[PDB]
A paper describes a structure:
We demonstrated that the TCR from the 1E6 T cell clone bound to HLA-A*0201–ALWGPDPAAA using a limited footprint and very weak binding affinity. Here, we solved the structure of the 1E6 TCR with 7 altered peptide ligands (APLs) determined by our previously published combinatorial peptide library (CPL) screening, 2 of which mapped within human pathogens.
We also solved the structure of each unligated APL to investigate whether structural changes occurred before or after binding — which, combined with an in-depth cellular and biophysical analysis of the 1E6 interaction with each APL, demonstrated the molecular mechanism mediating the high level of cross-reactivity exhibited by this preproinsulin-reactive human CD8+ T cell clone. Conversely, the stronger-affinity ligands A2-RQWGPDPAAV (KD = 7.8 μM), A2-YQFGPDFPIA (KD = 7.4 μM), and A2-RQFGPDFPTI (KD = 0.5 μM) exhibited favorable entropy (TΔS° = 2.2 to 14.9 kcal/mol), indicating an order-to-disorder change during binding, possibly through the expulsion of ordered water molecules.
Residue numbers in the entry:
A (entry chain A): 0 to 276
B (entry chain B): 0 to 99
C (entry chain C): 1 to 10
Write the structure that this text describes.
Amino acid sequence: MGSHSMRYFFTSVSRPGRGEPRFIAVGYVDDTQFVRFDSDAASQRMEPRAPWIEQEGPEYWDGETRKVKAHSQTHRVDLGTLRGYYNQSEAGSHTVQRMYGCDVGSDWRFLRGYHQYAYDGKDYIALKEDLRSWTAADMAAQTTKHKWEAAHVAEQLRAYLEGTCVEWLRRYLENGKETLQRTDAPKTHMTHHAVSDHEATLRCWALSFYPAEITLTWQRDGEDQTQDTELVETRPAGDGTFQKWAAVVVPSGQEQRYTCHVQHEGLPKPLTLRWEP
Amino acid sequence: MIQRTPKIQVYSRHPAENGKSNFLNCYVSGFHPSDIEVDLLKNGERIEKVEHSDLSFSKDWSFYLLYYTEFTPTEKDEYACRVNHVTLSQPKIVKWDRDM
Amino acid sequence: RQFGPDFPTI
Ligand SMILES: [Ca+2]
């Protein structure tokens, strides 16, 4: 399915009253979660979340567990350093977050890489698109940036993001092909809800689609309409697919002037729906 | 530091048909910090076998989770999601509407 | 496949 990404997400939350931070890691290919680690789970291992990763052998699982545990300890240290940088009490819970990953084009060649870090839900430091320089949000993060420049961290990340990240994303795409390279076009339908004798709501539905990216728009007489419309956030169905709807309020009897337009990777041409039931 | 209140949608996995098995979802998103309490309710009472996804976050660093359980919709039974978070002074309840 | 062997501290 054209363009692809692999991304890892990490969250650590300090627990001042007792013990180590809660740490949760998740890995995605596109919109499919494939691995997790949770510091509160019994296994203390990186775990599979998709069937196509279960075929990786024990050296894989050992390695990925060693990395993710190491990463958890880095965040444990960071939470204490940051508390001091921001002159915060030892009483409060704080949060670190990191995301990193790579994109490839339809040609499965490297497109871009990324690495960003946040403290208490705000940007802290990020790698720039050139993968050679850093964006620091404030003077604490500026100290980090000098540290990481002295240690040539960007060069190490760059090698990974242009090399290993891409090579393993490609391995995953071809091992998980029957799902990861399948596009599920939205299953669409319109519903009608009388509000009063004089106005009605048309609701356009997109169901069971993958990937999650989609565009629903309403037109009246062939021109885009946003007034008197509502659009919900795209939401997971729980079975790996996504859902969305858009609605418009119309004068009862004029429903046929309105059209819903649905754009999605799985659709060679956009769909157009019209109330003519 | 920044505190962001959760957005909440409550919906079924499949189109609701009275008497037929399905999955009830409560999707919470847009929140910070990550500690959150979410219950699914049937006629006001807490549903016990509720599962949830692994914590992840969006481009703006806000978190999202899916909570879900197997359920059988009917004509009379009311379903809802109840959410508490540091940004809410009291738990927020969102009723399931099968048309949304 | 995660980055390794480890991330530097901030
Ligand atoms: Ca509260």
